[PDB]
């Protein structure tokens, strides 16, 4: 409580200098490599500029916690709380835009002003609910509070519950789609190899004809995986493959086991030349798209697991415990530093590009 007031201006200042420096390097990477910027990137860069705006607002909180009481005016306090609320709402709705963009990209300026502009609307409840109360010998600036409560509840529902269910639907759909695509790809490849071994070790034409049936159904499925020259090299390599299965099913229908096994030995040449080369090409593209989603998943999970308890504490307390207030306050203020940390560990686009900045 009173002891906890002593450690947080050291922690918030350390949050301030690392959080300021962490996100300018992101936004100076955004100005040096504008050719490779992306939708997600732009939304992530807007989250970074909201983070350095919060980094500028942090030293006011540092002095206000170091003095033990609020020194500046009420305009400053509701400016600080509105800046924190616009940071939270900007992060939530930019992750909403990222989720929508990645859903419409995988399953299937003028944006940035809208997401920033819409965040002022939901943070307008913070501008009127917060006032400096001089109670119990302490002049502290905390929110306290029928139409205003209805406006707060409607804005809370519309800005939080719809994007959270929208995220937990969309990102699970992305993960399930990517994992089932990899599972279908590997199942088709394992069918094509295992039934080839079955044909090679077979003795009677009943299992040769039955294994080619399973090979033809998997080679027809793997052709649907995929006007480019690489597009013509993929599908024509499967038209040879299914066309060579039909040359062995026709031989196995005549009752020739040894001629069917020799004709299915030529399926190894097409599998090595046309199939295995684009098996690894399609596999490595799926592992890259999984790794990009795993960065976005870690960004969403860090943002909610840090900012949701402080938002629930301030909503419960103002509607109606000393240790949980300062723990939740430093947890949501810690998020300003955790965002460029995640871009430096698993953030492959940021890490390789920032290393080129140090060379230049």
């Amino acid at each position, epitope marked *: 409580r009173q002891f906890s007031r002593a450690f947080v201006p050291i922690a918030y200042s350390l949050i301030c200098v690392f959080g300021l420096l962490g996100n300018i390097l992101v936004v100076i990477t955004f100005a040096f490599y504008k050719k490779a910027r992306s939708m997600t990137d732009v939304y992530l860069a807007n989250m970074a500029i909201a983070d350095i705006l919060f980094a500028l607002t942090l030293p006011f909180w540092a002095v206000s916690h170091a003095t033990g009481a609020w020194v500046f005016s009420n305009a400053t306090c509701k400016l600080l709380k509105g800046i924190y609320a616009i940071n939270f709402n900007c992060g939530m709705w930019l992750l909403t835009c990222i989720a929508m963009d990645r859903y419409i990209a995988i399953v299937q300026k003028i944006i940035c002003l809208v997401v920033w502009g819409l965040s002022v609307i939901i943070s307008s409840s913070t501008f009127v609910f917060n006032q400096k109360y001089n109670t119990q010998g302490s002049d502290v600036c905390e929110p306290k509070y029928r139409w205003k409560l209805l406006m707060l509840g409607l804005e809370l529902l519309f800005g939080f519950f719809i994007p959270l269910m929208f995220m937990i639907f969309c990102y699970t759909a992305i993960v399930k789609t990517l994992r089932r695509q990899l599972a279908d790809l590997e199942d088709n490849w394992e069918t094509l190899n295992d039934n080839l071994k079955v044909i090679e070790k077979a003795d009677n034409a009943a299992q040769v004809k039955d294994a080619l049936t399973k090979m033809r159904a998997a080679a*027809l499925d793997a052709q*649907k995986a995929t006007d480019s020259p690489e597009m013509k090299d993929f599908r024509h390599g499967f038209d040879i493959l299914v066309g060579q299965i039909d040359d062995a099913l026709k031989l196995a229908n005549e009752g020739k086991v040894k001629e069917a096994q020799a004709a299915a030995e030529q399926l190894k040449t097409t599998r090595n030349a046309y199939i295995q080369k684009y098996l690894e090409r399609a596999r490595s593209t799926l592992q890259k798209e999984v790794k990009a989603i795993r960065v976005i998943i870690a960004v969403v999970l860090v943002f909610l697991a840090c900012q949701i308890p402080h938002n629930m504490v301030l909503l419960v307390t103002a509607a109606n415990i000393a240790y949980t207030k300062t723990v939740t306050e430093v947890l949501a203020f810690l998020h300003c530093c955790l965002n460029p940390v995640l871009y430096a560990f698993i953030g492959q686009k940021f890490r390789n590009y920032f290393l080129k900045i140090l060379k230049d």
Partner: antibody
Amino acid sequence: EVQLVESGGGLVQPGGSLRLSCAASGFNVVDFSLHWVRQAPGKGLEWVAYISSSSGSTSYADSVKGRFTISADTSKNTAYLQMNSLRAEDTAVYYCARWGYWPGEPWWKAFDYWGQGTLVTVSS
Amino acid sequence: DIQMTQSPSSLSASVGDRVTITCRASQSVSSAVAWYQQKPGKAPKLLIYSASSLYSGVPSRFSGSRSGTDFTLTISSLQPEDFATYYCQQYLYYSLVTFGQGTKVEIKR
């Protein structure tokens, strides 16, 4: 338009023989495999046999293997289903359908154009 | 050795209904499934090929879908002409084609 007609259906004794026809007009048999499909009176469709005029490859169902023999004649653009040892379960309507060749979209349109079928009835 | 199991053996519906006929393959047959319509006393007509693509000539109220080895023919709006028998067929190879049992669509009364 292109079409397939059928002929040779009729009434025979059990154990007899009958050669059906399927005159294809408007397209060539060297572009399409010709199939014979069977529908018993009151029952569903059942595949019998097919013929690949180009590669000469042919196949039959289990119930018609050995007794049935299908040939092609590209000079007259016809197909023949010679049926011998006609048991009592072979009285049906016979349809002659066409099917394209791998690769491409002609293979994916399975039995796009049919014939009107002929009734083959076996009874003593 | 690949069996198609057309589940509704008979169907009764009125004009304007949306009906769904389901078929199930014994093995995987990729998307090589066709849907045919036969009126009584006439040859079958191809409606759906490659399990989703409606044939050039049939109306657009017919649609097809694939979920694993479960294939579905959907008629969005019934019509007097719609009533007929419908067959699901797998065509994985020339010598392995098999039809479904059939589904007679009748008039609800």
